[PDB]
Design a protein around this ligand. Structure first.
Ligand SMILES: Nc1ncnc2c1ncn2[C@@H]1O[C@H](COP(=O)(O)OP(=O)(O)O)[C@@H](O)[C@H]1O
Ligand SMILES: Nc1ncnc2c1ncn2[C@@H]1O[C@H](COP(=O)(O)OP(=O)(O)O)[C@@H](O)[C@H]1O
Ligand SMILES: Nc1ncnc2c1ncn2[C@@H]1O[C@H](COP(=O)(O)OP(=O)(O)O)[C@@H](O)[C@H]1O
Ligand SMILES: Nc1ncnc2c1ncn2[C@@H]1O[C@H](COP(=O)(O)OP(=O)(O)O)[C@@H](O)[C@H]1O
Ligand SMILES: Nc1ncnc2c1ncn2[C@@H]1O[C@H](COP(=O)(O)OP(=O)(O)O)[C@@H](O)[C@H]1O
Ligand SMILES: [Mg+2]
Ligand SMILES: [Mg+2]
Ligand SMILES: [Mg+2]
Ligand SMILES: [Mg+2]
Ligand SMILES: [Mg+2]
Lengths: 371, 371, 371, 371, 371
C-alpha cells in the first residue's frame, strides 16, 4: 500500500513516496506547445510536452505554466502534468494508495475543491489530503514551534506555529516570488546590454540567477563596491556559446525581496513582513518565535540570505531577542520531506479524506475539514 | 502501383521511383531549337531536342533553359521536358502512380499552382505532392535536426529544421548558384585569353568548372601562391582539340560564393548567410544546428569547400561551438534520395494531393496545404 | 541662445529648435558606402553619403543603418550623421545652445553613456538632456495621464503615465517595428512573384508599404474578401517603370503587429501588450488609462489601425471601459513636438546636464539622473 | 513519269534520270562557231556545234564556254546546249517530267532566276528544282554530316553540313578551278618550250593535265628530285604526232591549288580555306567535320591529292583531330549521283517548284524558296 | 611637356595631343606587304607600308590588320604602326611626354601587359596609361552617368556608368563590328552580281558601306518597299570606272546589328544587349541610364540608326521610360576626344604609370592598377 507524496508547487513538482528521503521525481511544472509550423512527416511529435520534455524542446515550444500566483489556471494542462507524473515519473496507478497534496495557505478555495474532484475522478485515488506547505516544513525540521518563512517559485508565505495549532490571523501570503525575481533580473540584464526576452530565455535566466545571484549583507556599500570593482563580474556561457558577464545586477536582483518597491510592489520588505507576522502574535510566545525562524523554499538558497535576514530582523527586534534562523541544507525540499514524514506518520491515517467521503459529501467537505 | 519521384531542379532533372537508390534518369533541363537554316531533305529532324538530344546537338541548336532563378518561365518547354521524361526516360504513363515533385522554398506561388494544373491535366496523375528540397535532403541524411545548405544550379537556400517543423522566418533563399559561377568563370577566362562566349561554350565551361575548380582554404595566400607558381595550371582539351590551360581562375571562380561582390552581388558571403540564418533561431537550439550543418546540392561538390566552410563558420561562431558539417558522398542527389524515401515512407500516403481534391478545390488548395 | 531638439530615432532623424512647430530637418538615418569599383576620375565623390545623399545614390551605395533595435552599433557612422545634421541641415555650431536628445526606455545604458561622451567631446554642447520618447509624446498631446503606445521604425514601446511619474514596472519594450514590417512585406511580395531582395529595394518597399498598406478591421473576412475580389489590387510604379500590383499582402503585412507569430515572434499581439501593461497598473487608475490610449510613431499611420486597435482592446477589456484612443494628425512627429515644448518649457532649465557636470562627474551621472 | 537530273556544271554537263547509277550523257559545255571562211558547197554545216560535235571540229570552230566562274553569260548558247541535251542526248521532251538542276552556292541570283524562266518557257517543264551541288555530293556519299570540298572545272566551294541544315556563314566559294589549272599549265609548258596557245590546245592540254598531272606530297623535295631526275619526265603524243615530254611542270600545275599565289591569286591555299571554313563552325561540331572531309569534283582526281590534303590539314589542325578524308571512286560524279538519289527520294516531291507556281509568283519565288 | 593621346582602335588609329580638339593624325591600322614579285631595279620600295602608304598601294600589297577582335596579334606590325605614328604623323619622340592609350574592356590581359612593355622599352615613354574607351566617350560628352554603346570597326561594347564608378558585371563586349558588316555586305553584293572578293575590295567596300548604307526604321516594310521600288537603287563608281548599283542590300547590311543571326551570330540584337546590360543594373538607376543612352563609335554613323535604336529600346522598355539617346556630331571620335580631355585634366597626373614604376614592379602592376 504505502502512500504517495506530491509537492505540487509552481516551477518544480517534487514527487516521491511516504517514508522516502528524497523526492525521486523532480521536474518542472511546464507544458510546451509547438510554437511553429509542422513541416516534416513522421516527426514523432505530440502537441504537449512536459517537464524535461519541455526542457529539451525549450526553444521550440511555447512554454506555459499551468498555475500562477499559487492559483491553478490551466486545469487541463495541470491535470496532464499529474498524469505524466504518476505514470511516467512514478509509474504507479492512483488506486494503489492515497496521495498527499499540498498548498500555500490563503488561496482561492476553488483550487482545493477542483483538485479534489480531479483526484477522485480523473485519478480515483483511495484517499487524499491537502496539507499546508509551511506546516510540512516544520515536520521536516522536527519542530513544533517556529516561524515558517516559505518562499519559492510560486509565492511567499509566512506562518506562525506554536506547539502546533498555528495562528490564522497572523498568516500572511505575499505575492512575490522566484518568478518575479527572474523577470526583474531580465529587465536589469537589458540595462547591461543583454536582451533576454524569450520564455526560453526566462528559463535560461532562471539558471543564471541560480548560479550567480547572492544576497548582499550591506546592499548600499556592496553596490558602491561594485561601482568601483570588477571582482563581482562573473561570466556565464549561454547555450549558444554567448558568454555574458554580470556585475552588480548579481545581487540587485535578490535585493528586491528586501525592497519590493524595486518591482513596483506596494508591500514591505520580506523581513518586515516576517516581523509583522510575529507582531500579530501574543507577547507570551514572540520570543520563542524569534528563536525559531525557519526558512525554506528555493528562494532561500541564496548565499548570505540567512545572514542578511538575521541582520535585518535583529535591527527590527528589541535587544535580548536572540534571533535564531533555521535554514539547513536541503531546506529547498523541506515541504516534500515533511510530507514524506506526515504521510508515514501513523496517526495521519485518521486525517485522509476517503473517496467514500468524497462520494458522500463531495468537494466542500475537504474544503471544510482538510488543512 | 508504387510512386514516381521527380527532382525537377534547374540544370539537371533527376527521376526515379519510390524506394530506388539512384535517380535512374539524370539528364539536363535543356531544350534545343535549330539555330540555323534547314537545307537537306529527310534530315530526320524535329523542332525540339531535349536532355541528351540537346547535348548531342549542343552547337547546332539554340539552347534554352525553361526555368531560371528557380522560376518557371517557358511553361511549354518545361512541359515538353516532363513529357520526354515520363515517356522516354522512365517509360511510364502518369496514371500508373502519383508523382513527387519538389521546389525551393520562397518562390512565386504561380510555379506551384501551374505545375499542379499540368500534373492533373496534361498528365492526369493519380495524386501529386510538391515538397521542399531542403527537407528532402535531411530525409536522405536521416536527420530530424540540422541546417540545410542546399546550393545547386538554380538557387541556393538555407533552411533550419529542428526535430521537424522548420523555422520559416529564418529560411533564406539566395539568388546565387551554379549558373552564376559558370558565367563568372567565362568572364575571367576572357581575362586569360580564352574567348568563351557561346551557350554551347557555357555548357562546355560547365564541364570545365566541374573538372578543375576547387575551393581555396586561404584564398588570399593561395592567390599569392598562384601568382608565383605554375603548379595550379591545369590543361583541358576542348572538343575541337584546343587545349586550354587555367591558373588562378580555377579557384577564383568558386570563391565568389564566399565573396558575392565579385559578380556585383549585394548580399553577404554564403557562410555569412548560413550564420545569419542560425542567428535568427532561438539560442536554445543554435548549438545543435551548429553541429548539423548539412550541405547538399551540386555546388558543394568542390574540393575543400566543406573545409573552407567549416573554417569560415568557426570564425563567425563563438568558442565551444563545435561546427560540424555534414557532406557525404552523393550529397549531390540527396534531395532526390530523400524523395525516394519519403514517397516510400508509409505515412506519406496521407499527404498526397489527389486528383479528386484537385478537381474539387483546384490549384489553390495545394498552394495552401502542400509543403 | 535657445535650444536644439534632436529626435534621433531609427529610420528618420527629426531635428528643429525649441519652440518650433515642425522638425525642419527630416531625413533618413542612413549612411551609404560605395558598393562598387571606382572607375572615372574627378567623380566628385566621397566615401560616405548621408540622408538624402544616400537616397539619391540608393542603388550605388551599400546602405547601412548605424543603429538597430534602438541600439547604437556603428558609433562612427552615427556620429557622422549628427555632424551632417548640425552643420548642413541645421547649420549651427553645438556651443550655441544645449541639445535635447531622446531614447526609448529600457535600452542598454551604453547608448546613453556613449552619446553623452560624444555630445560633450565631439560636439561640446553647453548642456544636454536625453528624454524618454513616450513622455515627450504626451507633452505634444498636452496630457498628464495616458498610455503611450509608441511604435516607429526602430522599436515599439508602451509606457503608462498618470499625472506624471510613470510606472517603470509596467513599461514594456517590444522588438517589433517598421523595419520588420518592411522585411515581412518583401517576403510575401516574393510569394506573389516580385523578387524584391536588395536594400535599395528595402527602401523602395518601405515607400510601397507607406503608400498602400492598411489595417484590416476583420482580417479573416477581409482576407476572404481579397480571395474573391480584385478591388484591393493596387498598382505601384517602381522607379524603373516596372509597375507591380499588390493584393491581400497589402494588409497581411501590418496585420503582423497584431499576430507577431507571422514573423516567428514569441510575444503577444500589440493590443495584448497594451492591455497587459495596463493590467500591471493599479485598478485605481486603469480606467483613466483606458480613456487615454495615446498612439504615436510612424507605424500608427495606417488606415484603420486605430479603429482596429479600439476593437481589439474593447474585446480584451470589460464592459464600461470606454476605450478612448488618441491618435491626431501629425502624431508621427509627436515625440519631436513634445521635445520642442519641453525644451522651451521654462522649468526644464533645471534639468539640463551641463558640460561642467559632465566634466565633473562624467557619463554615469547622466545615466543616474537624466530621464 | 520519273524525273530528269541535269548536272549543269562548267566544262562537262552530266545528265541522266532519277534512280540511274550513271550520268548516261557526259559531254562538254562547249559551243563551236566556224572560225573560218565558208568555201565548198553542200558542206552539211550549221553555225553551231555542241559537245562532241565541237570536239570533232575542235580546231575548226571557235570554241566558247557559255558560262564562266559559275556564272551564265551567253544565255543563248547555254540554252542551245540544253536543247541538244534533252533532244539528242536524252531524247525526251521536257513535259514528260520535272528536272533537277544544280548550282554552286553564292552566285549572282540572276543565274537561278533566268534559268527558271528558261525551264518554264523554253522547255516548259512540269516542275523544276535547283539544288546546291555540295549538298548533293553528301547525298551520294550517304552522309548527313561533313565538309564538302567541291572543286571542279568551274569553281571551288566549301560547304559545312551537320545533320543537314548547313552553315551559310561558313560557306566559301573560291574562284579557282580546273580552267585555271589548265591555263597555268600552258604557261609553264611555254617555259619548257611547247608553245600551246590555242583553245583547241587548251582542250588538248586539258587532256594532258588529266593524264599526267599529280599532286606532290612534299612539293619542295619533289621539285628538288625533279631537278636531278628524269624519272618524272613523261611523254605525250599530240594529235599530229608531236610527242612532247613533261617534267616538273607535271606537279607544279596542281600545286597551285595549295599555293594560289602562283597564278596571282590573293587567297589562301585550298587546305587553308577548308580549315578556315571549319574554324567558322562551332567547336561542338568541328571534330565531326574533321572526321568527314568529303572531297569531290573533277579536280580531286589527282594522284595523291587526298594524301596531300590530309597532310596539310593535319598540320593545320591540333593533335587528336583525326583528319578523315572521304574521296571514293567516281566522286567526280557525286553531285549528279546525289541528284539521282534526291530526285527519286520520295519526300522531294514536296520541294519541286511547279510550273503553276512559276506562273503564279514567277522567278523570284524560286530564288526565295528553292535551295 | 604636355601629353600624347593615342586612340589605338582597329581600322583607324587616331592620334593627337592633350587639349587638342581633333585627332590630327587619322589613318588606317593597316600594314601592306608586297603581294608580288620584285622586277624593276631602284623601285624605291620597302617591305612594309602603313596607313595611307598601304592605301596608295592597296591593290599591290597584301593588306593585313595587326589586330582583330580587339586583340593584338601581329605585335611586330602593330609596333611598326606606332613607330610610324610617332615619328611621321606626329613627329615627336616618346620621351617628350606621356602617352594615353586605350582599350575595350574585357579583353585578354596580355594585350595590356605587352603594350606596357613596348611603351616602356621600344618607346621608353615618361609615363603611360591605358584607359577604357567607353569611359573616355563619356568624358567627351561631359557626362558622369549613362550607357555607353561603343561600336566601331573592332568590337562593340556596352558599359554602364553612374556618377562614375561603372558596373563591371553589366559590362558586355560583343564580337560584332564594322569588319563583320563589311564582310557581310560583300557576300550580299555577290547575290546581286558584284564579285567583290579581294582585301583591296574589302577596303573599297568599306567606303561603299560608309557612303550608301543606312538603317531601316521598319526593316520589313522597307524591304517590301525595295522589292517594288528603284528609289533605293544607288550607284557607286568603283576606282576602275565600274559603276555598280546597290538596292535593298544598302540597309540589309547594317540591319545585321539588330539581327546578328544573319551572319550566324548566336547573340541577341544590339538593342537587346543594351537593354540586358541595363537590366543587370539596379532599378534605382535604370531610369537615368535610359535617359542617357550615349552612342559612339564609327558604326553609329548610319542614317537613322539612332532613331531605330530609340524605337527598339522603347519597345523593350516599359512605359514612362523616356528613352533618350545621345549621339552628337563627331561622336565617331568621342573616345579620342575624351582622351584629350582626361589627359589635360589636371588630377589625371596622379594616375599616370611612370616608367619608374614599370621598372620597379613591371607590366603586372599596370594590369592591376590602371583602368
Ligand atoms: N539553488 C538555488 N539558488 C537560487 N534560487 C533557486 C535555487 N533553487 C531554486 N531556486 C529558485 O526557487 C524556485 C524553486 O523553488 P521551489 O521551492 O521548488 O518552488 P516551489 O515551492 O514554488 O516549487 C525557482 O524560482 C528557482 O529559481
Ligand atoms: N561534380 C561537380 N563539381 C562541381 N560542380 C558541380 C558538380 N556537379 C554539379 N555541379 C554543378 O552543380 C549544378 C548541378 O547541381 P544540381 O544540385 O543537380 O542542381 P539543381 O539542384 O538545380 O538540379 C550545376 O551548375 C553543376 O555545374
Ligand atoms: N505615412 C506612413 N504610413 C505608413 N508607415 C509609415 C508612414 N510614415 C512612416 N511610416 C513607417 O514608420 C517608420 C518611421 O516612423 P518614425 O516614428 O519616424 O520612426 P522612428 O521613431 O524610429 O524614427 C518607418 O518604418 C516608416 O516606414
Ligand atoms: N581524271 C581527271 N584527272 C584530272 N583532272 C580531271 C579529271 N577529270 C576531270 N578533271 C578536271 O576537272 C574538271 C571537270 O570536272 P567536273 O567536276 O565535271 O567539273 P564541273 O563540276 O564544273 O563540271 C575539268 O577541268 C577537268 O580537267
Ligand atoms: N561615316 C561612316 N559611316 C558608316 N560607317 C562608318 C563611318 N565611319 C566609320 N565607319 C565604320 O566604323 C569603323 C571605324 O570606326 P572607329 O570607331 O574609328 O573604329 P575603331 O574605334 O575600332 O577605330 C569602320 O569599320 C568604318 O567602316
Ligand atoms: Mg514550495
Ligand atoms: Mg537542387
Ligand atoms: Mg520614434
Ligand atoms: Mg561540279
Ligand atoms: Mg573605338
Amino acid at each position: 500500500t504505502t502512500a504517495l507524496v506530491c509537492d505540487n508547487g509552481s516551477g518544480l513538482v517534487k514527487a516521491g513516496f511516504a517514508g522516502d528521503d528524497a523526492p525521486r521525481a523532480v521536474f518542472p511544472s511546464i507544458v510546451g506547445r509547438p510554437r511553429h509550423q509542422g513541416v516534416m512527416v513522421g516527426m514523432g511529435q505530440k502537441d504537449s510536452y512536459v517537464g524535461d520534455e519541455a526542457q529539451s524542446k525549450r526553444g521550440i515550444l511555447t512554454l506555459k505554466y499551468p498555475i500562477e500566483h499559487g492559483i491553478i489556471t490551466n486545469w487541463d494542462d495541470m491535470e496532464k502534468i499529474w498524469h505524466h507524473t504518476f505514470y511516467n515519473e512514478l509509474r504507479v496507478a492512483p488506486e494503489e494508495h492515497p496521495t498527499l497534496l499540498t498548498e500555500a495557505p490563503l488561496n482561492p478555495k476553488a483550487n482545493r475543491e477542483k483538485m479534489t474532484q480531479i483526484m477522485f475522478e480523473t485519478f480515483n485515488v483511495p484517499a487524499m489530503y491537502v496539507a499546508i506547505q509551511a506546516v510540512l516544513s516544520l515536520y521536516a525540521s522536527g519542530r513544533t514551534t517556529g516561524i515558517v518563512l516559505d518562499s519559492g517559485d510560486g509565492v511567499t508565505h509566512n506562518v506562525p506555529i506554536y506547539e502546533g495549532y498555528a495562528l490564522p490571523h497572523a498568516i500572511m501570503r505575499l505575492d512575490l516570488a522566484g518568478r518575479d525575481l527572474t523577470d526583474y533580473l531580465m529587465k536589469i540584464l537589458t540595462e547591461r546590454g543583454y536582451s533576454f526576452v524569450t520564455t526560453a530565455e526566462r528559463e535560461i535566466v532562471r539558471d543564471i540567477k541560480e548560479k550567480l545571484c547572492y544576497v548582499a549583507l550591506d546592499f548600499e556599500n556592496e553596490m558602491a563596491t561594485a561601482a568601483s570593482s570588477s571582482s563581482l563580474e562573473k561570466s556565464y556561457e549561454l547555450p549558444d556559446g554567448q558568454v555574458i558577464t554580470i556585475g552588480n545586477e548579481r545581487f540587485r536582483c535578490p535585493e528586491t525581496l528586501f525592497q519590493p518597491s524595486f518591482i513596483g510592489m506596494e508591500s514591505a520588505g520580506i523581513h518586515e513582513t516576517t516581523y509583522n507576522s510575529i507582531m500579530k502574535c501574543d507577547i507570551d510566545i514572540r520570543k520563542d518565535l524569534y528563536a525559531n525562524n525557519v526558512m525554506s523554499g528555493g528562494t532561500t538558497m541564496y548565499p548570505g540570505i540567512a545572514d542578511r535576514m538575521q541582520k535585518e530582523i535583529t535591527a527590527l527586534a528589541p535587544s535580548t531577542m536572540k534571533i535564531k534562523i533555521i535554514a539547513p541544507p536541503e531546506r529547498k525540499y523541506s515541504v516534500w520531506i515533511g510530507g514524506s514524514i506526515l504521510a508515514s506518520l501513523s496517526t495521519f491515517q485518521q486525517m485522509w479524506i476517503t473517496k467514500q467521503e468524497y462520494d458522500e459529501a463531495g468537494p466542500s467537505i475537504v474544503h471544510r475539514k482538510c488543512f
